[PDB]
């Protein structure tokens, strides 16, 4: 009888989709190869005093899996749209992910958070102002994260749940 939220993590290869999810679930970062390409996780959390169960779908982002993207997305209630701040192509891809989500959910109003990951790095190619303005143009929150240091990780997922809760009031 507990409220469940279905989250889907999307973004280009190597942006840190899995690392962010593993930090949320296991509270660690380990840079090691893992051959799985489709993983569902369940985590019970308390957000604003309300307990819920997150079902988090984390799939590999390489283009060779692109035919499955819409089918994974179609299961989601909310989307963590991740790019890496040192990967300009991953930021350019965000527009196409947003368009695909809108198409799959048949709506211009879909719970979504833009995540700029790898903020621990000493260099970056994507300016924070550019990402903030993009998020504003979509009407979604923007959060900078590091799966390595854990900065912003809880805030990214919890903000997404808050976005779903607000959407369900409509
Ligand atoms: N410095 C730093 N490295 C990170 C961060 N997040 C992930 N990485 C590293 O970047 C690489 C890709 O991370 P991974 O979580 O596998 O990314 P993914 O988005 O799930 N890739 P795929 O689409 O192939 O499943 C790994 O070497 C990982 O350790 C971060 O916040 N900071
Ligand atoms: Mg990979
Ligand atoms: Mg992954
Ligand atoms: Mg640093
Ligand atoms: Mg909005």
Author numbering: 0 to 169
Quote the study's own text.
RAS proteins are small GTPases, cycling between the GTP-bound form (active) and the GDP-bound form (inactive). RAS proteins are the central node in signaling pathways controlling cell proliferation, survival, and differentiation through interactions with various effectors, such as RAF, PI3K, and others. KRAS, one of the three RAS isoforms (KRAS, HRAS, NRAS), is the most frequently mutated RAS protein in cancer patients, and G12, G13, and Q61 are three hot spots among the oncogenic mutations. For example, the KRAS G13D mutant (KRASG13D), which has a reduced oncogenic phenotype compared to G12D, was found to favor State 1 conformation (with the switch I region open).
To gain detailed insights into the State 1 and 2 conformations of active KRASG13D, including the Switch regions, we solved high-resolution crystal structures of GMPPNP-bound KRASG13D and KRASG13D in complex with RAF1 RBD at 1.2 Å and 2.0 Å, respectively. The electron density associated with GMPPNP, magnesium, and switch regions was unambiguous in the high-resolution maps. In the GMPPNP-bound KRASG13D structure, Switch I is in State 1, since it moves away from the GMPPNP, and T35 does not contact the Mg2+ ion. Methyl and 31P NMR spectra of active KRASG13D in solution confirm a two-state ensemble interconverting on the millisecond timescale, with a major Pγ atom peak corresponding to the dominant State 1 conformation and a secondary peak indicating an intermediate state different from the known State 2 conformation recognized by RAS effectors. The refinement protocol fixed the major conformer to the State 1 conformation (represented by the GMPPNP-bound KRASG13D crystal structure), as indicated by the 31P spectra. We calculated RDC-refined structures of the GMPPNP-bound KRASG13D starting from the corresponding crystal structures (State 1 conformation) and allowing a maximum 3 Å displacement of the heavy atom coordinates under simulated annealing using all experimental RDC restraints. The pairwise RMSDs between these and the ground state (i.e., the starting crystal structure) are between 1.0 and 1.3 Å (with no significant displacements of the switch regions ). In the GMPPNP-bound KRASG13D, a consistent deviation between the ground state and the excited state can be observed in the allosteric lobe, which has not been previously reported due to the lower resolution of the solved structures. In the RDC restrained model, the slight departures of β5 and β6 strands of the excited state relative to the ground state result in a displaced α4 helix away from the ground state (crystal structure) position.
